[PDB]
Amino acid sequence: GSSMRAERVGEQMKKELMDIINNKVKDPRVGFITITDVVLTNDLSQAKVFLTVLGNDKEVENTFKALDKAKGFIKSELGSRMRLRIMPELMYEYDQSIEYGNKIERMIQDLHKQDRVE
C-alpha cells in the first residue's frame, strides 16, 4: 500500500536482504528472523528493512548489531544482487506493523557501495 516502484524494488531487496541477514549473518542465539516489509522511501533510494525477530529489544538490536557489525558484508552481498545498477541504500528498521514500535535509535552508515576506489 505504498509507492509501486518502492514496493517492487524494495521487496526485491526483501528477497536479497532476507537472504543476506538470515542466510549470511549469524542468528544462533535468537529466534527466526522475518523480513516483514522492506520498502523503499518515497525518494526511491532507500530500502527500509522492517524485521521481526524473537528476542529482546537488545536481541532485536543484536540482530541489528550483527547487521551494523558485518554491514559491508551485508552491503557486498547487497552489491552482489546483480539486478540493479543504481544503489538504493538499506535501512535497518524494526517492524512497526505487528511488532511493538521501538525506533529509539539507528545507525545508517557504513555504506560499502562507495567502494569506487581511485
- Bridge partners of residue 90, in order along the sequence: 47
Per the listing, cell 548489531 goes with 65
Instruction: Please list, in sequence order, all residues whose beta carbon lies within 8 angstroms of the beta carbon of residue 61, skipping any fewer than 6 positions away.
Output: none
Distance, CA of 35 to CA of 52 (rounded, Å): 6
Distance, CA of 53 to CA of 95 (rounded, Å): 9
Helix or strand holding residue 110 (H, E): none
Q: Is 113 exposed, middle or buried (0-12, 13-18, 19+ CB in 10 A)?
A: middle
Which domains, and CATH codes, for the chain?
4-114 (3.30.300.20)
What are the grid coordinates assigned to 18, written together? Answer: 532476507
CA distances from 21 to 53, 54, 85, 116 (A): 11, 14, 21, 24
DSSP string covering 10-71: HHHHHHHHHIIIIIIS--SSS--EEEEEEEE-TTS-EEEEEEEESS-HHHHHHHHHHHHHSH
- Bridge partners of residue 39, in order along the sequence: 48
CA distances from 20 to 1, 33, 101, 105 (A): 25, 11, 24, 22
Helix or strand holding residue 5 (H, E): helix 4-18
CB–CB of 111/89 below 8 Å? yes
CB–CB of 59/30 below 8 Å? yes
Q: How far apart are the first and last CA of the chain?
A: 42
What is the separation of C-alpha 22 from the centre of its chain, rounded to a whole number of angstroms? 11
Q: Is 105 helix (H, G, I), strand (E, B) or coil?
A: coil
The answer to whether the Cα torsion of 94, 49, 35, 10 is positive or negative is positive
